[PDB]
């Protein structure tokens, strides 16, 4: 497998939703859009179960590719959720 591989998470609301902080992600940012992990908040699922870490990148929101979505669109679509979390991520840097 390549290091920066694309994977999907299937999770849901436990303590709360994610527990993660974001950096950049505006008009364009990473690639053809894209949002980037700043760091993990040690209060939620991302820490607890172990799914996302620093410098990981997001792609799709519940199947759908966010081609050219702004920071406001990315943030709004994160908070206007409810229970379930389906997303696709691209791995950032190498863990091991």
């Amino acid at each position: 497998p390549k290091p920066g591989d694309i994977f999907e998470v299937e999770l849901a609301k436990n303590d709360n939703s994610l527990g993660i902080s974001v950096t950049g992600g505006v008009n364009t940012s990473v690639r053809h859009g894209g949002i980037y992990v700043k760091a993990v908040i040690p209060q939620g699922a991302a820490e607890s179960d172990g799914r996302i870490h620093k410098g990981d990148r997001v792609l799709a929101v519940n199947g759908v590719s966010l081609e050219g979505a702004t920071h406001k669109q990315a943030v709004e679509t994160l908070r206007n959720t409810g229970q379930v979390v389906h997303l696709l991520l691209e791995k950032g840097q190498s863990p091991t």
Binding site: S17, I20, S21, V22, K38
Partner: peptide, 15 residues
Amino acid sequence: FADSEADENEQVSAV
């Protein structure tokens, strides 16, 4: 003034 062109919404988020 407002309701038109640009507001301030390009900083940092968490969820």
